[PDB]
């Protein structure tokens, strides 16, 4: 089979094609072929003409796309072409990679990227990791907000953890005369977390209004999806420091890696089609007036494109067009207007590199395990976290939550309540209580 790989604007060199030759794909029975095509126009007419020429002049059935600009119309054009040409098209690393919902029916167009539900789940996991059970929701009248809120509420309801979900706002933002209305409804966000969802242009205005009201400070944290962040190196001088965002893996994912993954997915789909239901391993190419393409019956092939293993990677897609197991990173706005990778999200896991979440009245406390004084239990098997009469307990050696308790723990809780200070308990590693050894203490 012949898969066409199209690159637009600045990209890699022919060396990437080498990875498509010396790989498991060549050794497989699919024996695929690659015809790299480089373009510099990036226009609808140019893209359509190039696709038509490749389909007609060359015998190809799959297309891998990768642009350089951030125009989202490329994804829509690719979806339209796939719906018309009835041929699979994969978009990666550019406007084609941007996730678009509500694709046209009978369109075999796929792209790399997460959905709103996955980002909401990642945000909930991040919140649960640091025990942030009280939060609010702020959104605008932008498509996808309903899905975001519904996913958040469904996750909150079908769980044994104790959440708050105090308030949710709508923030019309459409009526210019109702400018004071946004400020009026913004004075109900006493909860620490906010979990905003809106566009970057509206995000800047909302942040300025909140700063005027006084919702930005040491005691408030904002979590936003990748839509708000937009370009990483284009901070609009208004995002509060410490903002947390969820983004796609753009640093530990090279363009040649994406090209190889797409080629492998196409080859595996072709091999699966050839093995099972061998009536037509691959339909022939076509040209304009594709009405006679019903004989191809791409519906059978479509079901095969959503199941790819690739030596234990689970590259399967979804019926909508987004991959089921993407790679996601958590970024935080540094002091010097920079985004840093704090943690990564596996299939079902979290590898945050910060165990204390660094930012006066916040000090660390050391405790030791004692029979009647400090009992170190384990997390609750039902909800996954401790419960009343228990407090979180770190365990160095990378860490493990323990949720210690006991007489001394109760005394510490009462003292903290009375003096109004926060703490982060953790157990000691070497030394039980303390003794001067060679002039030095321990424990």
């Amino acid at each position: 089979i012949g898969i066409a790989v199209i690159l637009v604007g600045t990209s890699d060199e022919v060396a990437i094609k080498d990875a498509h030759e010396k790989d498991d794909f060549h050794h497989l029975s699919v024996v695929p072929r690659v015809e790299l095509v480089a373009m510099n126009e990036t226009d609808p007419k140019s893209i359509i003409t190039r696709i038509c020429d490749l389909m007609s002049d060359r015998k190809i059935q799959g297309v891998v796309f990768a642009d350089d600009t951030d125009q989202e119309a490329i994804a829509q054009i690719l979806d339209f072409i796939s719906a018309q040409t009835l041929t699979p098209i994969l978009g990666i690393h550019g406007g084609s990679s941007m996730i678009m919902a509500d694709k046209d029916e009978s369109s075999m167009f796929f792209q790399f990227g997460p959905s709103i539900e996955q980002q909401a789940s990642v945000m909930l996991n991040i919140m649960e990791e640091y025990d942030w059970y009280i939060f609010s929701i702020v959104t605008t009248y932008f498509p996808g907000y309903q899905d975001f809120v519904n996913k958040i509420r469904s996750t909150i309801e079908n769980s044994f953890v104790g959440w708050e979900l105090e308030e949710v706002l709508l923030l019309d933002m459409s009526l210019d005369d109702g400018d004071s209305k946004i400020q009026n409804q913004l004075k109900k966000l006493q909860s620490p977390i906010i979990l905003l969802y809106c566009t970057k242009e509206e995000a800047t205005y909302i942040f300025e209004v909140a700063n005027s009201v006084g919702l930005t400070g040491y005691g408030y944290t904002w979590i936003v999806p990748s839509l708000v962040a937009g370009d990483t190196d284009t901070v609009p001088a208004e995002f509060p420091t410490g903002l947390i965002s969820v983004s796609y893996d753009e640093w530990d994912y090279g363009l040649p890696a994406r090209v190889r993954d797409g080629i492998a997915i196409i080859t595996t789909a072709a091999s699966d089609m050839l093995s099972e239901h061998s009536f037509i391993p691959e339909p022939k190419s076509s040209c304009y007036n594709t009405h006679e393409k019903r004989i191809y019956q791409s519906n059978m092939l479509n079901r095969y494109l959503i199941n790819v293993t690739f030596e234990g990677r689970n590259l399967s897609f979804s019926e909508d067009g987004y991959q089921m197991h993407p790679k996601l990173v958590i970024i935080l706005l540094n002091k010097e207007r920079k985004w840093e990778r704090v943690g990564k999200w596996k299939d079902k896991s979290l590898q945050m590199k910060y165990y204390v979440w660094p930012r006066d009245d916040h000090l660390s406390i050391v405790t030791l395990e004692e029979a009647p004084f400090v009992i170190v239990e384990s997390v609750d098997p039902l909800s996954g976290t401790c419960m009343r009469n228990t407090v979180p307990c770190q365990k160095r050696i990378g860490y493990i939550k323990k949720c210690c308790k006991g007489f001394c723990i109760d005394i510490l809780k009462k003292i903290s309540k009375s003096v109004k200070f926060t703490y982060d308990l953790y157990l000691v590693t070497n030394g039980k209580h303390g003794k001067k050894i060679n002039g030095t203490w321990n424990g």
């Binding site: 126009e41 226009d43 609808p44 007419k45 359509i48 119309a73 054009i77 919902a101 498509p143």
Partner: protein
Amino acid sequence: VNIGAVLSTRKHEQMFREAVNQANKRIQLNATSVTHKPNAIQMALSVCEDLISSQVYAILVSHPPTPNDHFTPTPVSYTAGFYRIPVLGLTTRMSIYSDKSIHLSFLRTVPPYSHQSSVWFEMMRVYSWNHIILLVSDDHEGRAAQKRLETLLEERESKAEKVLQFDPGTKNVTALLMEAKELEARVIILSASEDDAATVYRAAAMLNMTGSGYVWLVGEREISGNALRYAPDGILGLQLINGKNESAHISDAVGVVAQAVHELLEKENITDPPRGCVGNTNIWKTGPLFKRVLMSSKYADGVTGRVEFNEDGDRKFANYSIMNLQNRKLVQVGIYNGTHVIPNDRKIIWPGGETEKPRGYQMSTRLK
């Protein structure tokens, strides 16, 4: 300084040119029209060539015979959205062109089908109905209609009793009808395509689902063609006043475009649109401003009434006619003037032949 039009006949293009010329007398801008093509790719290429030939500020799109709205105006909108050139739809109510995420810089001259859900609210308050069921189809249009109806109902703290969905094109809906039969609710609201509506009509009246009580509410696609042929008596359908009319829509579109152009001419820093798709790849840098000017433009008075644009670029304050099928006929029993429904002096019939509105609620006395 000119505008583009994609009509379905030469007569429509001539009418559009005449309307633009007449509006000119009320600059030297001249109209440009292109006919539809059977192939979507060919249509996109033709629209791109037309755009390259001359700079276009706005593009109007119509529907030819065999509309197939899912792909008739889609290529034009996709091509125009690359440069953020506003596109106005003449006869398109698929409700998929309302989200700005997919279709950018799009405006409507007729309300989408989803807005019909609002029409089924005054009748819910003027007839004292509180228990209803939904037979919405499983697609984008059905989902939008159901969401709008649920949002409207949530205001009064009373949602639908039970919302059921069916896969499009299904030939066996007996299970859903049987499930909904024992629900103590008599008001039935249907939202599906012509073929789906006709299929639902069959295998439904079979189980005495028509007659005493059982108020039926539908939209506009349900009472049409095959579905209308199988529609039972007492169906309360909705009709658009000027939906079919095309010349009036063209006239109002031309007037609104001219008014927006005149308003924008006063403003400075007006970058000209690119003179050709090839080579040019940057945004217009003024498309959002032109779209904003086009929206929120209170037209004085058009042939089809006052022209208002919604926050989503859809028609605002439309007028609907309520039709009640009787003796295989169709008569108007009321007019919904955008905000309220006023009945006429004609009697209203019901599926059971009664002259009084059924209560629409049958409480069950056999408990489990």
